[PDB]
């Protein structure tokens, strides 16, 4: 505390929040678990070893000799279900899930703002163990304009404050930094630099086995009359994302309403894929007159 007309220290003020930090946690655990996410199947184990495991026991990671992650990227297509993996982590880590947008650390004037990047990590340290997810780094991992001058200094400073802090509050799990990105080939290395992060988990639109489980979990809640096979559908919708599979499930059931029915059937699904998949990467229709 300083005085207005004299500016002398009279008291200490204990900070833990400001309005922005208050909206970043806690939601008292989401509705998504690994129960509610289908297979990927190997990349489920990896994301677990990267976060959850050193969290309960940085003593066992140090003891062995191995460095835990310094930050976690999830990188892959949209809608493969990534921010979706982040809610799951939240339910079972039981460790306060900070949801913040990387857009909010870059603000109109200066140390609204830059102060905020150091504020999220101060919070992190007292709330520990934690679990900060920031989220699609495209405005905290942006390349430098040189310069836009109002814009550019903010994005440049705030980029550096992220990387330098994680490096330094983590030799060993204490605060784990977790995150995700859609694209990273649009921007220069900062989080793609191996002297800062070092664990990038490839999370790709799903394997054959993965597709079936997602159809299974969506259909679990759906009312059905059995002649359905999820595996055949899975083949057709090869090369599609986890959200395309959801979009088909939601249309098959709407389709059922049009039929005057509330039970879904294999016929209902196959139509549902045709609509979607056709507005999407394509369906074959000719193999030449010189091949079968």
């Amino acid at each position: 505390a300083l005085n207005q007309q004299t500016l002398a220290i009279v008291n200490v003020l204990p900070t833990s929040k400001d309005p922005m930090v208050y909206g970043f946690e806690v939601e008292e655990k989401p509705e998504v678990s690994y129960e509610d996410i289908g297979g990927l199947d190997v990349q489920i184990e990896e994301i677990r070893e990267a976060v959850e495991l050193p969290l309960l026991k940085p003593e066992l990671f140090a003891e062995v000799g191995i460095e835990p992650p310094k930050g976690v990227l999830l990188y892959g297509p949209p809608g493969t279900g990534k921010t979706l993996l982040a809610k799951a982590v939240a339910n079972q880590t039981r460790a306060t899930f900070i949801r913040v947008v990387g857009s909010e650390f870059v603000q109109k004037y200066i140390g609204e703002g830059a102060r905020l990047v150091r504020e999220v990590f101060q919070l992190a340290k007292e709330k520990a163990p934690s679990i900060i997810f920031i989220d699609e780094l495209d405005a905290i991992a942006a390349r430098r304009t040189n310069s836009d001058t109002s814009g550019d200094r903010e994005v440049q400073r705030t980029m550096m404050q992220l990387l330098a802090e994680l490096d330094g509050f983590d030799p060993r799990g204490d605060v784990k930094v977790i995150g995700a990105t859609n694209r990273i080939d649009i921007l220069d290395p900062a989080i793609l630099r191996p002297g800062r992060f070092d664990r990038i988990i490839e999370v790709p639109l799903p394997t054959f086995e993965g597709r079936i489980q997602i159809f299974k979990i969506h259909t679990r809640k759906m009312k059905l009359a059995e002649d359905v096979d999820f595996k055949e559908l899975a083949r057709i919708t090869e090369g599609a994302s986890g959200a395309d599979i959801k979009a088909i499930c939601t249309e098959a059931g709407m389709f059922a309403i049009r039929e005057e029915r509330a039970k879904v059937t294999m016929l209902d699904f196959t139509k549902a894929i045709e609509k979607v998949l056709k507005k999407t990467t394509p369906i074959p229709d000719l193999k030449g007159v010189m091949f079968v």
Binding site: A1, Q4, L13, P14, T15, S16, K17, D18, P19, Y22
Partner: protein, 49 residues
Amino acid sequence: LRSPPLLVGVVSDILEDGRVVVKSSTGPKFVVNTSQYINEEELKPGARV
């Protein structure tokens, strides 16, 4: 006080020592003491005042 000049400030956080950190819309945050002309229950981060 109920008359203007009046200034909207929006509560930053609330302290239990008997003070409130208000982020003013002017710029600066400041610590001001509580009164029996408010409730701090009604005050929250993002409470206009």
